[PDB]
Amino acid sequence: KETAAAKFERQHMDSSTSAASSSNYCNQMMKSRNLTKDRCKPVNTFVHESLADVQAVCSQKNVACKNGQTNCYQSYSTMSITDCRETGSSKYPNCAYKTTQANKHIIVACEGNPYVPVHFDASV
Ligand SMILES: [Cl-]
Ligand SMILES: [Cl-]
Ligand SMILES: [Cl-]
Ligand code: NA
Numbered sequence: 001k002e003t004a005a006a007k008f009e010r011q012h013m014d015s016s017t018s019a020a021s022s023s024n025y026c027n028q029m030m031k032s033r034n035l036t037k038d039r040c041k042p043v044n045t046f047v048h049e050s051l052a053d054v055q056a057v058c059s060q061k062n063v064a065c066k067n068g069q070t071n072c073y074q075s076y077s078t079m080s081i082t083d084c085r086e087t088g089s090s091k092y093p094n095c096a097y098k099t100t101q102a103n104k105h106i107i108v109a110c111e112g113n114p115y116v117p118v119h120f121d122a123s124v
Pocket of ligand 1: 010033034
């Protein structure tokens with residue numbers, strides 16, 4: 001049974017690459033992180049920075065989350081991210097994703113001790 005912090009890592013961290021360099025990145029990564037197992041997760045973002053740099057966002061700019069909670073933080077700097085979004089022709093079990101690489105600020109919700117990211121709110 002996964003902790004919230006571990007689930008964030010599995011769903012959103014890809015430090016091994018600096019950026020998505022292929023249109024098939026999302027297809028491969030959504031599968032290998034087990035996000036297509038029982039359903040196609042419709043949207044997911046991967047962050048290509050070190051785990052320490054992402055954890056550090058919990059000490060950056062405190063902002064409201066989309067749901068109105070106040071434990072969200074926006075990174076001071078932009079970060080390399082990949083947005084993965086199901087295509088209109090995607091349907092389980094043959095999940096298919098569009099890969100969009102960008103450099104944006106990330107907004108995460110933080111919780112716990114240590115205070116670490118548990119939810120990916122948005123990128124700007
Ligand atoms: Cl897993
Ligand atoms: Cl996401
Ligand atoms: Cl402030
Ligand atoms: Na946790």
